[PDB]
Structure 1
Amino acid sequence: LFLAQEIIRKKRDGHALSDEEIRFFINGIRDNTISEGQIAALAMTIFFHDMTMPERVSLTMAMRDSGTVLDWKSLHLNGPIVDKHSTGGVGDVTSLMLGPMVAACGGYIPMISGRGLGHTGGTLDKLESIPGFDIFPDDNRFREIIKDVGVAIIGQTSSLAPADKRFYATRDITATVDSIPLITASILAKKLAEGLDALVMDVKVGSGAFMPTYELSEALAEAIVGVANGAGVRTTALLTDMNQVLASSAGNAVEVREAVQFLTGEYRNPRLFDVTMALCVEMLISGKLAKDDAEARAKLQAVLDNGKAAEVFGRMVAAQKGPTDFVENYAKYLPTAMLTKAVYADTEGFVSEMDTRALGMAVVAMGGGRRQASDTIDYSVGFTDMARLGDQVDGQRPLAVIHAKDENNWQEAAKAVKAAIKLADKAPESTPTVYRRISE
């Protein structure tokens, strides 16, 4: 129906908005006919009245259909269209391994990513530290890589969920961003555009988590499962730990390198391994590529050990303009910094605390990302050989190994790192890597 004022009022007076009404409002948001104030007002009424399951699904759908919705029916692929989604994290490089691994098991992953300006090391920028990697293939080319290779990590060709652009921008300045119904629809809008069959949300918990409390991370996880499954996509979610860096490194080139050494068994961080394996099992199960966890973990460990996984990564990289021999000779292609020195904590002890966001911002500030846009990322700067909680430190074990441009910013970051990692006289109680699985 018509009138933005009309719609705002209904919801304000504790009523449920119709699909036609929610759809009308969202397009108006996209077509710039519905003002900022009209957006901020509706967001608030939702913050006080919430939205029923039907309203929740209609909001998401009307946002998905705001832009373009991919369809792979014509391609007649012989496998499930699946993909994973995270709420971000520092060292969260699971996507580079996840994509190849699941494609090597019969799954098609049309990973339309979107970096993460603000304070989030998107994967798109990591993949750009690979000489020639084109993250912008046209539709027809993209459709080809998927069918041929199985995976493809590309940047959003804008027209995905446009309404979310204005809706989110307003919410950020009007104090209505922390509203579960709105968040749920915002996150899934982009993904549900990919024309998926199944999905898996990786909801982080802890200091570096999106939601403030475990109870709130869990809350969001349950909401996501509901509307996605309501929208037709077999979804499950996991609560991953993010109280420290996931991989043994944070940056761009250093992370893509880590993803290669993982795929080839040259080195595998155990925590990164658990989360990586846990997400893939879900995708296989949701995708029907396995009847149970045991079957799935089996197939995955195989592909990971017979080199078939790293092979797919290598085929994905080449099809997107990277070297055709990236996995074998990556050390000659990836950018190496001028200064690489290890940093040590002031005293001997056990790592008991760590501010992920701090380390995250330490990376950006040293060139690892962009605070504005005009900034140009130094794809070689970052951290490696990161200390894990519980690790005893001293002259034998530094906190991390810093890859900086010069002795100055090295020194800067060195102080940043040392300030972000808290020591203690004794090792803290351990926490799980994968807390639990929300489903149905």
Structure 2
Amino acid sequence: LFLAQEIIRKKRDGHALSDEEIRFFINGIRDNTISEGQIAALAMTIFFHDMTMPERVSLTMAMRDSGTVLDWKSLHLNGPIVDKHSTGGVGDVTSLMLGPMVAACGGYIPMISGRGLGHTGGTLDKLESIPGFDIFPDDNRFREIIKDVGVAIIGQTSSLAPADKRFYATRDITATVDSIPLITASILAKKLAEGLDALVMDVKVGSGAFMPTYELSEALAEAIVGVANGAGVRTTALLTDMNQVLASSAGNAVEVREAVQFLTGEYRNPRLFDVTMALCVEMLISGKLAKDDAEARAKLQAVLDNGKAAEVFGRMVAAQKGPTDFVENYAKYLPTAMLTKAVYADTEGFVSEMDTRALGMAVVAMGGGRRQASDTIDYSVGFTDMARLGDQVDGQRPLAVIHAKDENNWQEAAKAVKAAIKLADKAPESTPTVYRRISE
């Protein structure tokens, strides 16, 4: 003894770790007695040897239990505790509508979300375009908001799955991010710390997805579903498309605008609608708020149609210290960019493919995301009026409208947008927005 090196050795040599060994190691990460080198070594043994279902469950539970785990029972709420997690993308603004929609249908959604990562936007960064919006309410205040409003969207505190914090920080500099068991455990350590009854996972497929192939997207989804249900949380996953921007916009303020306009019925991108609705349906069914797809859809459509979902969003924004008249007066509050100007393709044709990773990185480069954690976001910049795959583009239809912080910035963004998009003389074959549903 001590065990940490023995545990690494055991996994290195292809043996399954016991629940005891996994818990010991995770606890050692938590109390800073296990070093970065030892975390990295174990991570790499897992990359090479994988983990069985029991190992994956142990690892997930251990990481979940390394910090605060929320419990709702004592509020005596009359609805299920339910949430959604996305692997991330570009224009992936679903949460801003989905939280209010499900809340309006009787769910309670304690959504611990995230900032932008690599080429992907982040829900917390989008919300921080709203002046005053506070992603870090205190423990008691968060509980009040969930009780009174039904939904809140917040950041990850120091008390949330702290062993995952160090594990992920090490993974991200040692080429051990790309491991299904590690990703599954990391995602669920955080989501399961919310004290959920039910969860839906959105695993992205395509050029803007983190997993590089459909098959790997599918395997991740399967892993998460298996582990989460193993933990007593009713969970399903949808594999959904990220071969183009999902919303009609990409950025921060611009995506909040899109969310509001979706909720009020001004404008609804049909692909964003399809994904948002499908994810909400899973939450209602898993949360036992509806018996089937048709009933779920009817309830969700009703709260869009009668303004209830929009009202919940407004109440959420107010409760998290944004403006009390935000839905009504968002234009007053959301910052506008210095220069807003359309980018047109160099030729006429059909949008045939769009490197959605490259589009994501273009927004980062404009100042709408970060390359390092200390970077400051410009909340106004990004894209609107995105062309979709199959759109005919010409002098009357741009590839996008670019919201830029100055003219030099606009030129570089326009260059990146054009480079990311290929035109063809025929429309590409259409693709489903939702490829598949994975259940226990």
Task: State whether residues 235 and 439 of structure 1, in contact with CA within 8 Å, keep that contact through their aligned partners in structure 2.
Answer: yes
Q: Which segment drifts farther, 330-339 or 242-251?
A: 330-339
Task: State whether residues 116 and 369 of structure 2, in contact with CA within 8 Å, keep that contact through their aligned partners in structure 1.
Answer: no
C-alpha deviation, 1:255, in angstroms: 0.5
Cα distance in 2, alignment partners of residues 377 and 47 from structure 1: 34
Cα distance in 2, alignment partners of residues 203 and 32 from structure 1: 32
1:186-213 per-position Cα deviation (integer Å, ceiling 9, x unaligned): 1111100011110011000011111111
Task: State whether residues 119 and 358 of structure 2, in contact with CA within 8 Å, keep that contact through their aligned partners in structure 1.
Answer: no
Task: State whether residues 114 and 122 of structure 2, in contact with CA within 8 Å, keep that contact through their aligned partners in structure 1.
Answer: yes
Residue equivalent to 2:353: 353
Paired residue secondary structure (1:328): helix
For residues 60 and 33 of structure 1, do their structure 2 counterparts lie closer, same or farther at Cα, with a shift above 3 Å needed?
Answer: same
Cα distance in 2, alignment partners of residues 410 and 174 from structure 1: 35
Cα distance in 1, alignment partners of residues 104 and 368 from structure 2: 31
Task: State whether residues 116 and 370 of structure 2, in contact with CA within 8 Å, keep that contact through their aligned partners in structure 1.
Answer: no
Cα distance in 1, alignment partners of residues 39 and 155 from structure 2: 27
TM-score by length of 2: 0.98
Task: State whether residues 82 and 198 of structure 2, in contact with CA within 8 Å, keep that contact through their aligned partners in structure 1.
Answer: yes
1:303-322 per-position Cα deviation (integer Å, ceiling 9, x unaligned): 01010110100110111111
Residue equivalent to 1:92: 92
For residues 119 and 226 of structure 1, do their structure 2 counterparts lie closer, same or farther at Cα, with a shift above 3 Å needed?
Answer: same
Paired residue secondary structure (2:328): coil
* Structure 1 runs of 4+ with >4 Å offset: none
Structure 1 regions of 5+ residues with no counterpart? Answer: none
Q: Which segment drifts farther, 220-229 or 9-18?
A: 9-18
1:99-142 per-position Cα deviation (integer Å, ceiling 9, x unaligned): 00000000000011121344332111111111211111111111
For residues 226 and 132 of structure 1, do their structure 2 counterparts lie closer, same or farther at Cα, with a shift above 3 Å needed?
Answer: same
Cα distance in 1, alignment partners of residues 207 and 119 from structure 2: 15
Cα distance in 1, alignment partners of residues 33 and 251 from structure 2: 41
1:282-315 per-position Cα deviation (integer Å, ceiling 9, x unaligned): 0000000011011101100100101011010011
Q: Which segment drifts farther, 300-309 or 117-126?
A: 117-126
Structure 2 regions of 5+ residues with no counterpart? Answer: none
Cα distance in 1, alignment partners of residues 195 and 41 from structure 2: 31
1:367-406 per-position Cα deviation (integer Å, ceiling 9, x unaligned): 1122223332111111100000000010110110111122
Task: State whether residues 57 and 227 of structure 2, in contact with CA within 8 Å, keep that contact through their aligned partners in structure 1.
Answer: yes
Residue equivalent to 1:307: 307
Cα distance in 1, alignment partners of residues 251 and 264 from structure 2: 20
Task: State whether residues 119 and 371 of structure 1, in contact with CA within 8 Å, keep that contact through their aligned partners in structure 2.
Answer: no
Paired residue secondary structure (2:402): strand
For residues 337 and 173 of structure 1, do their structure 2 counterparts lie closer, same or farther at Cα, with a shift above 3 Å needed?
Answer: closer
Task: State whether residues 89 and 119 of structure 2, in contact with CA within 8 Å, keep that contact through their aligned partners in structure 1.
Answer: no
- The answer to whether structure 1 residue 379 and structure 2 residue 383 are counterparts is no
C-alpha deviation, 1:182, in angstroms: 1.4
1:48-78 per-position Cα deviation (integer Å, ceiling 9, x unaligned): 3322211110100000011110111111111
TM-score by length of 1: 0.98
C-alpha deviation, 1:184, in angstroms: 1.1
Residue equivalent to 2:220: 220
Cα distance in 2, alignment partners of residues 215 and 193 from structure 1: 28
Cα distance in 2, alignment partners of residues 11 and 383 from structure 1: 47
Cα distance in 2, alignment partners of residues 8 and 212 from structure 1: 29
Paired residue secondary structure (1:327): helix
Q: Which segment drifts farther, 156-165 or 41-50?
A: 41-50
Cα distance in 1, alignment partners of residues 109 and 372 from structure 2: 31
* Pairs within 5 Å for 1:65-104: 65-104=65-104
Q: Which segment drifts farther, 297-306 or 26-35?
A: 26-35
Cα distance in 1, alignment partners of residues 343 and 67 from structure 2: 47
- The answer to whether structure 1 residue 250 and structure 2 residue 275 are counterparts is no
C-alpha deviation, 1:365, in angstroms: 1.2
C-alpha deviation, 1:19, in angstroms: 1.2
C-alpha deviation, 1:179, in angstroms: 1.7
Q: Which segment drifts farther, 340-349 or 122-131?
A: 122-131
Cα distance in 2, alignment partners of residues 423 and 158 from structure 1: 46
Residue equivalent to 2:196: 196
1:309-360 per-position Cα deviation (integer Å, ceiling 9, x unaligned): 1010011011111111111121111111121111100000000011111111
C-alpha deviation, 1:43, in angstroms: 2.1
- Number of aligned residue pairs: 440
Paired residue secondary structure (2:202): strand
Paired residue secondary structure (2:182): helix
Task: State whether residues 2 and 24 of structure 1, in contact with CA within 8 Å, keep that contact through their aligned partners in structure 2.
Answer: no
1:142-197 per-position Cα deviation (integer Å, ceiling 9, x unaligned): 10010000010111222111112222232233333222111111111110001111
Q: Which segment drifts farther, 175-184 or 319-328?
A: 175-184
